[PDB]
């Protein structure tokens, strides 16, 4: 089959899900609390076994009053939406959800290989062909999303999570959204945002290719293209209209960037006549077989040490706090549908 | 350096989220 035909396919899959979502599919006490992987300001994803199989699970325990202090009631519920009817190699699909008196749970697997983050500031920066063999799984990730119609609007190396042969998941749908036209929220990552977001236009799919451009120069040059101690220095950079390039970036590298890190979107890769393959028939590319990427049988240019099925290792240490169930139901009515 | 100005700045942790 053509890619168009697996993607049409793959829609038919998803719009079943997506106008008949899971609901209630577990209880908190089928799992059993390991440890802490990472916080965000309404929630964390901690490490759990779920008792009656032995599997180990992420588990994004939300709680329901912070979520509505921050104003992410409707983005909340898009994100268990949409990832309890995805499936793809390189996301991590709902495998339950639930809520109680005081958050919403969604588990998802378990990526034991931590966060890119972690690994490309320890390591200081990737290889190109290491960064490549990343992108090309963000590639094709994005290629299907798109084809959905969701929009992810938070790609970084922060929510890259590695798993046990070294390919990604991207994670946290926090932001994605199923929109056909153009969108209005001020959200993302300053690093990552595309010029669009910052100067408030409706904007469209194109900021994740933007995104991509960041995030391929990060994984290269070991920092983003547009840096400062204050998100507002940083979008005087962003909206500027200049990026400098490492000594050590190949020429495809710099063509490539250019054309994802472009203000133009009439220009912008990915978001022309011949959408993504603008991207994958670039010479950066070349060496790249998607069709092997994509059954992961590529050989990973690094893969995560291990010691067990739950070892922990290549995670940061986070405080330990109790997952605290009120006696009284908080904010039922605005997650109904979760 | 650029790796230097990098290193040195305060956003070389795990960057939030924002929103409006
Ligand atoms: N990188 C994250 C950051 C994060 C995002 C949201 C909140 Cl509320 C808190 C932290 C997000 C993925 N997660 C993760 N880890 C391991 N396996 C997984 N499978 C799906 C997600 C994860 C590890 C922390
Ligand atoms: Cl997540």
Redesign the pocket.
């Known amino acids: 089959e053509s890619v168009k035909e697996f993607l049409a396919k793959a829609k038919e899959d998803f719009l079943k899900k997506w106008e008949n979502p899971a609901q209630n599919t577990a209880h908190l006490d089928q799992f059993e609390r390991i440890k802490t992987?990472?916080?965000?300001s309404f929630?964390?994803?901690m490490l759990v076994k779920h008792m009656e199989t032995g599997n180990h699970y992420?588990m994004?325990i939300?709680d329901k009053q912070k979520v509505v202090k921050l104003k992410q009631i409707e983005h909340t519920l898009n994100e268990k939406r949409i990832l309890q009817a995805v499936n793809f190699p390189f996301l991590?699909k709902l495998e339950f959800s639930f809520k109680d008196n005081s958050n919403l749970y969604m588990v998802?697997?378990?990526?034991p290989g931590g966060?890119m983050f972690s690994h490309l500031r320890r390591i200081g920066r990737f290889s190109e062909p290491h960064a490549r063999f990343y992108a090309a799984q963000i590639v094709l990730t994005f290629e299907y999303l798109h084809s959905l119609d969701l929009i992810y609007r938070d790609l970084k190396p922060?929510?890259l999570?590695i798993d046990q042969q070294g390919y990604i998941?991207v994670?946290?749908f926090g932001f994605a959204k199923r929109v056909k036209g153009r969108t209005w929220t001020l959200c993302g990552t300053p690093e990552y945002l595309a010029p669009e977001i910052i100067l408030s236009k409706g904007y469209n799919k194109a900021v994740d290719w933007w995104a991509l451009g960041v995030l391929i120069y990060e994984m290269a040059a070991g920092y983003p293209p547009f840096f400062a101690d204050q998100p507002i220095q940083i979008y005087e950079k962003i909206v500027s209209g200049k990026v400098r390039f490492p000594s050590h970036f190949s020429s495809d590298l710099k063509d490539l960037l250019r054309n994802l890190l472009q203000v133009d979107l009439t220009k912008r890769f990915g978001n022309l006549k011949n959408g993504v393959n603008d991207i994958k028939n670039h010479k950066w590319f070349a060496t790249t077989d998607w069709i092997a990427i994509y059954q992961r049988k590529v050989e990973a240019p690094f893969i995560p040490k291990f010691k067990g099925p739950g070892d922990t290792s290549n995670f940061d240490d986070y405080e330990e706090e109790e997952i605290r169930v009120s006696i009284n139901e908080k904010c039922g009515k605005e997650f109904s549908e979760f | 350096t650029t790796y230097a100005d990098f290193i040195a700045s305060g956003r070389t942790g795990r960057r939030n989220a924002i929103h409006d």
């Open positions: 992987l990472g916080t965000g929630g964390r994803v992420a994004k939300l991590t998802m697997e378990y990526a966060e922060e929510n999570m998941k994670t946290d």
